[PDB]
Design a protein around this motif. Structure first.
Motif, PDB file in Angstrom:
ATOM      1  N   UNK B   6       0.826  -1.197   0.000  1.00 13.30           N
ATOM      2  CA  UNK B   6       0.000   0.000   0.000  1.00 13.30           C
ATOM      3  C   UNK B   6       0.865   1.254   0.000  1.00 13.30           C
ATOM      4  N   UNK B   7       0.204   2.357  -0.296  1.00  9.13           N
ATOM      5  CA  UNK B   7       0.815   3.669  -0.381  1.00  9.13           C
ATOM      6  C   UNK B   7       0.015   4.498  -1.365  1.00  9.13           C
ATOM      7  N   UNK B   8       0.467   5.738  -1.572  1.00  7.25           N
ATOM      8  CA  UNK B   8      -0.290   6.648  -2.432  1.00  7.25           C
ATOM      9  C   UNK B   8      -0.332   6.225  -3.892  1.00  7.25           C
ATOM     10  N   UNK B  46      -2.593  11.932  -5.650  1.00  4.12           N
ATOM     11  CA  UNK B  46      -2.395  11.829  -4.215  1.00  4.12           C
ATOM     12  C   UNK B  46      -3.701  11.812  -3.437  1.00  4.12           C
TER      13      UNK B  46
END
Lengths: 50, 49
Positions: B6-8, B46
């Motif tokens: 996971x992450x942006x 984002x």
């Protein structure tokens, strides 16, 4: 004894790392705790692994 | 960029299957894509509902 909005902290683009064990970083709003403790300190970048 | 990650980008721009059976290939591009004063032609996302 409060309402903890964890979506703001996660989405903010300011943290170098956000790694969760035991819990998933996304499914955190639908769980609640008896207490939560925040252990706060400064380290050297290379010490994050420890 | 990995299955289970996971992450942006993993959530907003490039999500992989959790059963992915492939390869991640990478090399630096400091002498090709980068431009003096900042090359502003690579867009990211984002925020997403």
């Amino acid at each position: 004894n409060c309402v903890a909005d964890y979506s703001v902290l996660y989405n903010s683009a300011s943290f170098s790392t956000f790694k969760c064990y035991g819990v998933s970083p996304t499914k955190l709003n639908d769980l609640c705790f008896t207490n939560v403790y925040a252990d706060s300190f400064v380290i050297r970048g290379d010490e994050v692994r420890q | 960029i990995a299955p289970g990650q996971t992450g942006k980008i993993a959530d907003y721009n490039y999500k992989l299957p959790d059963d992915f059976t492939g390869c991640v290939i990478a090399w630096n591009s400091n002498n090709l894509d980068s431009k003096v004063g900042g090359n502003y032609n690579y867009l990211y996302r984002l925020f997403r509902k």
